[PDB]
Motif scaffolding. Structure first.
Motif, PDB file in Angstrom:
ATOM      1  N   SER A  80       0.825  -1.205   0.000  1.00 43.15           N
ATOM      2  CA  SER A  80       0.000   0.000   0.000  1.00 43.15           C
ATOM      3  C   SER A  80       0.864   1.262   0.000  1.00 43.15           C
ATOM      4  CB  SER A  80      -0.943   0.006   1.207  1.00 43.15           C
ATOM      5  OG  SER A  80      -1.809   1.130   1.177  1.00 43.15           O
ATOM      6  N   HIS A  99      -9.964   3.215   5.485  1.00 43.95           N
ATOM      7  CA  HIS A  99      -8.572   3.031   5.079  1.00 43.95           C
ATOM      8  C   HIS A  99      -7.592   3.040   6.248  1.00 43.95           C
ATOM      9  CE1 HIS A  99     -10.402   3.887   1.226  1.00 43.95           C
ATOM     10  NE2 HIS A  99      -9.261   3.649   0.604  1.00 43.95           N
ATOM     11  N   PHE A 120      -5.785  10.973  -1.161  1.00 39.70           N
ATOM     12  CA  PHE A 120      -7.008  10.657  -1.881  1.00 39.70           C
ATOM     13  C   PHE A 120      -6.933   9.264  -2.499  1.00 39.70           C
ATOM     14  CE2 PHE A 120      -7.117  15.257  -1.640  1.00 39.70           C
ATOM     15  CZ  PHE A 120      -8.457  15.548  -1.465  1.00 39.70           C
ATOM     16  N   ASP A 121      -8.081   8.596  -2.574  1.00 40.49           N
ATOM     17  CA  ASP A 121      -8.197   7.318  -3.269  1.00 40.49           C
ATOM     18  C   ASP A 121      -9.483   7.317  -4.085  1.00 40.49           C
ATOM     19  OD1 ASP A 121      -7.963   4.625  -4.130  1.00 40.49           O
ATOM     20  OD2 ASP A 121      -8.982   3.895  -2.338  1.00 40.49           O
ATOM     21  N   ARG A 122      -9.330   7.332  -5.406  1.00 38.11           N
ATOM     22  CA  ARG A 122     -10.460   7.348  -6.327  1.00 38.11           C
ATOM     23  C   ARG A 122     -11.414   8.498  -6.021  1.00 38.11           C
ATOM     24  NH1 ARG A 122     -10.320   2.049  -4.212  1.00 38.11           N
ATOM     25  NH2 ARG A 122      -9.095   0.607  -5.514  1.00 38.11           N
ATOM     26  N   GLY A 123     -10.857   9.692  -5.836  1.00 42.10           N
ATOM     27  CA  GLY A 123     -11.655  10.886  -5.626  1.00 42.10           C
ATOM     28  C   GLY A 123     -12.113  11.092  -4.194  1.00 42.10           C
ATOM     29  N   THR A 124     -12.019  10.043  -3.388  1.00 44.60           N
ATOM     30  CA  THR A 124     -12.440  10.112  -1.997  1.00 44.60           C
ATOM     31  C   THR A 124     -11.270  10.479  -1.093  1.00 44.60           C
ATOM     32  OG1 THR A 124     -14.128   8.422  -2.406  1.00 44.60           O
ATOM     33  CG2 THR A 124     -13.547   8.877  -0.107  1.00 44.60           C
TER      34      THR A 124
END
Lengths: 153, 155
Positions: A1, A93, A58-62
């Motif tokens: 990750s 997360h 951020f991850d996929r816009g979130t």
């Protein structure tokens, strides 16, 4: 990750508001962080300031990680301290190294600013915050006092 | 700009007063090198004092510094509001239990209202009996943990 962090600039108000929303959700205080937000101009001016730092992941816009901090240029010496005010990681997360990545990014900012120390406070019972800051820093138990400026002294 | 037992807000043209406040800190905190021997340039102090996010208050008895308060104004990010953080506060041992600290803090309240800041807060250590006693009277106490992080080490 491999967590990617970013320093939010004044031309990124939406990303900043997403971070604010993240704070409200993870701190369980949505109105404080979501329903009373500053204007675009205020946020643009604050982000343009040299004494405010906003980091995020951020991850996929979130928004999955957020860090809001102040730079305090000291009065006793020509030196600077970094004060982390709020730090949160999305509940979706946790334990992925998001918090570690933010602080590592903040260290890079601190170094290029010439700041000699970073600090932060944790509430008793906040088990993950205590765990993180214990591994990354030195603990000192202290007292905090809130003073109402409108009341007589 | 207040009459109590004399408190003033230090401006950028009052470096001498500022250094005096710094020197007072060093003696009362018993940390002279930190506050007296490593002081900033005239220019640095003038720029810092000119800033809107720094406040320096001083109490004078005889042109002699007998009290000092150094604080930061934190314009918040979650809302259009401001918090005033008291970093250091000291009173000359020669002028203890005379209302000096209360005076400075009363003066800070005025500045807070004027700025529109909704809260003032301050930290204190265990064992610092006079600070704890003062702050317990003037506000609400909450125990927290402070963590120091070295920016030069790996995470």
């Amino acid at each position: 990750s491999i967590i990617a962090t970013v320093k939010i600039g004044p031309d990124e108000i939406s990303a900043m508001r997403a971070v604010l929303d993240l704070f409200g959700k993870e701190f369980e205080d949505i109105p404080t962080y979501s329903d009373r937000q500053p204007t675009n101009e205020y946020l643009a001016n604050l982000l343009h300031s040299e004494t405010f730092i906003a980091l995020a992941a951020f991850d996929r816009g979130t928004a999955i990680g957020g860090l809001a901090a102040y730079v305090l240029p000291k009065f006793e010496q020509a030196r600077s301290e970094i004060y982390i005010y709020d730090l949160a990681v999305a509940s979706s997360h946790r334990r992925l190294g998001v918090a570690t990545a933010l602080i590592s990014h903040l260290k890079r900012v601190a170094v290029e600013l010439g700041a000699y120390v970073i600090y932060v406070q944790a509430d008793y019972g906040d088990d993950p915050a205590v765990a993180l800051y214990t591994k990354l820093g030195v603990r000192e138990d202290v007292m905090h006092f809130d003073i109402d400026p409108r009341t007589a002294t």
